[PDB]
Amino acid sequence: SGFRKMAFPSGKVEGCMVQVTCGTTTLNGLWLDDVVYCPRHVICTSEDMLNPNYEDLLIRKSNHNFLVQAGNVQLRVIGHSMQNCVLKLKVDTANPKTPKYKFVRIQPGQTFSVLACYNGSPSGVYQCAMRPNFTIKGSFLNGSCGSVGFNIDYDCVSFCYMHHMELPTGVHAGTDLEGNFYGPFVDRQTAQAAGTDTTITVNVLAWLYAAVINGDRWFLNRFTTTLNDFNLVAMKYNYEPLTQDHVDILGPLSAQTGIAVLDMCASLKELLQNGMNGRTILGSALLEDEFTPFDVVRQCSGVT
């Protein structure tokens, strides 16, 4: 028993982290087979970042301008290309620690693990969610660009995020491993405001199920509601609308606990309207939305 914000074991990804240096800029790269993936802004001076023309900056760069170091050993770059906002550096050596892997573009509300890295060296691992405004709330200092987000299915690492920038509000923006930004963000040092950071309703419901499973049940009430009635309250409280797809996804937690999804919706509605009144749920004074229904099943069942 007990419920923790839990990251995937990071060893498979630690095995892939390298240092990329172009001129005086160093950041992190991901070494899979004989390709190193990194943010294309590795080619920018801090001046360049104000208004970079990436195609024009890249003309001035050759293979030997990209310095790739894996541990204390230099990789030979035999090719480079730009795909959206990432550089792919072809090296002459396949990463021998390359795990089974996929590139996946996640949806808002989806959770993943970040291996925060500096100079191609892992510092830490944390769990986070793609926010409905396509930001993430990470912990990233200068040099952390190219740090990656991932999920693991048994022995297959699905990479979903590469870190690129911090917005002036101190939230984070990045790409999938095809170099396409989540949300409207660009790899430029300009005014970029995030939209409304709404609460991931289905994730809150999953976490309330996790709480019931772990014995925290004080918030269970006498009421039910409808998807339409619930959604009126959701909208008022900047919670994402709940769809029948979300209800279906919560089916197994509903079944395990014998609490119908709409009854749990009515409990959540009373928590929004009444607040927590100084009480906690799974040791939180606010409603946690960075567990997916899949995360709650995984942690409550013990998947490895």
Added chain:
Amino acid sequence: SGFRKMAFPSGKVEGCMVQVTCGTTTLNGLWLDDVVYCPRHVICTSEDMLNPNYEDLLIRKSNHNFLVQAGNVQLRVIGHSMQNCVLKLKVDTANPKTPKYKFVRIQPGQTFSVLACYNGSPSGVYQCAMRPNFTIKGSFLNGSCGSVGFNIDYDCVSFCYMHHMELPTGVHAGTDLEGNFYGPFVDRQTAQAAGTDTTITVNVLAWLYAAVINGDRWFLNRFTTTLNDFNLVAMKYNYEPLTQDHVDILGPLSAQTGIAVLDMCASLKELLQNGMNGRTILGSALLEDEFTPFDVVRQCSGVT
């Protein structure tokens, strides 16, 4: 910027996890050099756990009764001994992935990473603290016994915890890697109540410093206090007494932020007396005490 509950990268420890089976009991072992460490209750039936005589149960066990599997490969057990509440199984093969390592017994308030494992396979990694009542608030299902807690200093894993039991209140108890329980707990299925779970004051102060550093400053007030005055409020709110040793440890965060430790104490005092009034700090509606001053410096500076 941003501040996350961050675990150490787990790969060095993933490399050490094995499955130990004695009779019908399977749990996790830690394979360092040619020794596998595991909870001695691996030799107990669920009946045995009510009143185990470990010395007498162990007489009935030989080397070949301990089945050690690392991946899908069986290790040969050439010796076994009981040290306090752990078994040490000598195997004929040194773990080739053995990291540089130490065994350390931590103090209450100290944080560490847990690699939660089942059948010797890592499922997840989370950060937690040795509570002042020598419990930890983990996430452990049946089969998670032998899962270990650790800190990393560059390339040296300091193992500080092995998971042994869940108390009837659903909090967790375990040993250092010499098999000595944290607190008064025993590896027996009996009434065992935890003492007062007090708040780790120095850790709250560290986290308030982390908040100031990351731009969350609304709680900074006009007041100071003394260690004696502060400690009167601490005691009233079940916070641990603050010592001059704690003040000294907070010195570098004090220096970085230009907020004297006693002024931050006076801010914390007003937060205890006034509550958060529906406001958050680093996205928490309560005061987080599972970051050490060292954790805050590490995360705010980017140590790898």
